[PDB]
Design a binder for this molecule. Sequence first.
Ligand SMILES: NC(=O)c1ccc[n+]([C@@H]2O[C@H](COP(=O)([O-])OP(=O)(O)OC[C@H]3O[C@@H](n4cnc5c(N)ncnc54)[C@H](O)[C@@H]3O)[C@@H](O)[C@H]2O)c1
Ligand SMILES: NC(=O)c1ccc[n+]([C@@H]2O[C@H](COP(=O)([O-])OP(=O)(O)OC[C@H]3O[C@@H](n4cnc5c(N)ncnc54)[C@H](O)[C@@H]3O)[C@@H](O)[C@H]2O)c1
Lengths: 348, 346
Amino acid sequence: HHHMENIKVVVWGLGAMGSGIAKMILFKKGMEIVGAIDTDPNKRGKDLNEILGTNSKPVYITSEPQDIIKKGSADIAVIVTSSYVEKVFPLIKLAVENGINVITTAEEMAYPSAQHLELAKEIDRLARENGVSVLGTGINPGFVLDYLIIALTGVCVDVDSIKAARINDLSPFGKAVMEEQGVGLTPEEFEEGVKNGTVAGHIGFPESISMICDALGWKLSGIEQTREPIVSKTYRETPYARVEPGYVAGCRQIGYGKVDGEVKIELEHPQQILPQKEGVETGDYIEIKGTPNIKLSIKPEIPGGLGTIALCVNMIPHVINAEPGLVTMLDLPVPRAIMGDARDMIRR
Amino acid sequence: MENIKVVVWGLGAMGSGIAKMILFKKGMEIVGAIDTDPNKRGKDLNEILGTNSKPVYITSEPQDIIKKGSADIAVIVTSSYVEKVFPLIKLAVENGINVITTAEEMAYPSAQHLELAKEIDRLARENGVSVLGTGINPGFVLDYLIIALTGVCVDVDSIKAARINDLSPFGKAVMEEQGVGLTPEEFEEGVKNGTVAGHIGFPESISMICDALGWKLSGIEQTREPIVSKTYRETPYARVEPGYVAGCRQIGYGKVDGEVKIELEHPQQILPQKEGVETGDYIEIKGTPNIKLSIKPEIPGGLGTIALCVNMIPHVINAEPGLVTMLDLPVPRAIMGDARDMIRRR
Ligand SMILES: NC(=O)c1ccc[n+]([C@@H]2O[C@H](COP(=O)([O-])OP(=O)(O)OC[C@H]3O[C@@H](n4cnc5c(N)ncnc54)[C@H](O)[C@@H]3O)[C@@H](O)[C@H]2O)c1
Ligand SMILES: NC(=O)c1ccc[n+]([C@@H]2O[C@H](COP(=O)([O-])OP(=O)(O)OC[C@H]3O[C@@H](n4cnc5c(N)ncnc54)[C@H](O)[C@@H]3O)[C@@H](O)[C@H]2O)c1
């Protein structure tokens, strides 16, 4: 109890999520930053406080992970870089080999066995052999279209099917996001955009669907997805995009989880600029068909960015406290805000 | 490889709902049914459930079936009070049997019964078993689910939440419990003498939230006012002409440094739709960000509690020994596979 050291965090990746996570860790009593890593030459060497506009014991961003990812130097690394297991696995490996807990936002890491069984097995072996835990989380995947749905099923005698949607407004975002979701394209330019990879859709549905089925004990016979344009019937314009009727207002990603060849789970993530233009309200919508039926909604949707920053930080005690190994949102206690001293949440 | 063996202690609305569910759940078995009601003592549980399965005879002597090795878990669905369920919990735990119970106070027994809670935790750890109180409210929608949403919040100012049902289909017992058809005069008279029970659980819910968030409570305050109809409302068990109490509204206030941080409200009334009132579970978290969640209609209190009790059985078995709350366990989930595959060995 006496002279508990602050939870020591390395933020690894300092883009949008890295920055927000760092700001929050500072603001939280019980946690402190001991390292900041990024490959960005613009950021190399700078004091973290300058990047975020804050006053604290200065931390100097390194492009070299290994002068902070050392044995016993930090409690937990927060890896906010790539979407893909194969691109954060080398970072995860380095962190756990030095006995450092890991939280990552990588969508594929929300349930890595869904698409990377052998790599997920290796993360678990490495985390166990080193006595630390690895968690992938986020708002989606990681919370609203998996963990939250799963929790609701806990009040059901029986679940027939699950249909859920998450709807946002792309209008605050810049050109890079517009191009990821095909805003402004023609339907035909959308198809080649998807087929060549400029249209990103949404990453994480195989992870979310697999997590649900494992949780409920369904055995998947297949996972299908579609990534199709949201063809506008109206005029919509923001500083970074202009869609006229017949042009693509955004991208609708759909995930189908199949049991015995039948759809038990359908997840939808339509992303577009200004859905108010055609009466589409933002929000997270969950419907459970079974005994009983359950219809939940959060309007507007839980903020993708703010929520992922908050959830990442809030899960730090749980990943530290968790038994060693790779963990998912199916293994940890309930998420919760840290309105007290984070040191009190550590199991000693 | 072997079925999860369950004893159901108490066979009322919840007990028989839970037994019927366990019967039809793969990997789960009822090995015993306890109830002191003479109209139930001695009967085949199937006679009560209306089911057609292997006979299980209801005993009123707990010692007949609560003994070392006879069950993995007892499900206690009798009283709302720690005082009244503690002897049952004690018997089951002293025989190495995990416990789940629906008793509202047991959702967070430290709130109002810290010393009893400490002893439950001690007996359970001494006997290598776990104890959990749960339910829809308290136990899920106005505590666990609220807490879960704050986990996406950078910072929480306050929490306000209401759960609204319709007492219409329930009957004379429940009507009198909620003061339906009374007078605002008899209502408070009913509250004082205890004939109007309102809702048990807000201290447990409010305390669970604070402990979860790291808030330190200055105190809990509760009101239990009536709901005066402006309308004629008639069910086969009540008649409420305008001016008379259509139901009871419970409100709980969690105060931190004297300021109100949590307000929970549970208006139970017949036919809320005869005025404008929509049923549902309503949660609003004021902070960064703000979150407004709505479950329409509300999670059915009876059916959801039956389901949640059964679904939590493997998590309580798998939990490490001692008293646990919904703050300690993995996420609730429906059991659509074989419950035996969920049992983890240490
Ligand atoms: N709900 C969710 O699951 C969720 C939510 C938000 C973000 N994400 C994912 O998290 C990741 C981070 O998102 P973001 O908004 O911070 O993106 P971003 O592009 O703003 O951040 C990327 C940063 O990481 C750095 N980086 C990249 N590779 C690196 C490496 N090998 N070593 C060190 N630094 C490296 C880059 O230089 C950049 O500064 C993205 O892949 C995103 O898809 C998931
Ligand atoms: N959300 C929640 O947390 C939640 C929801 C529903 C019910 N509950 C609680 O669970 C309890 C069960 O509710 P219910 O509707 O089934 O009540 P009920 O009155 O319908 O059934 C109670 C049964 O238990 C039996 N019983 C009582 N004391 C006993 C003893 N010492 N030994 C053996 N049998 C005994 C009675 O004979 C009766 O059949 C209630 O106290 C209720 O408040 C909680």
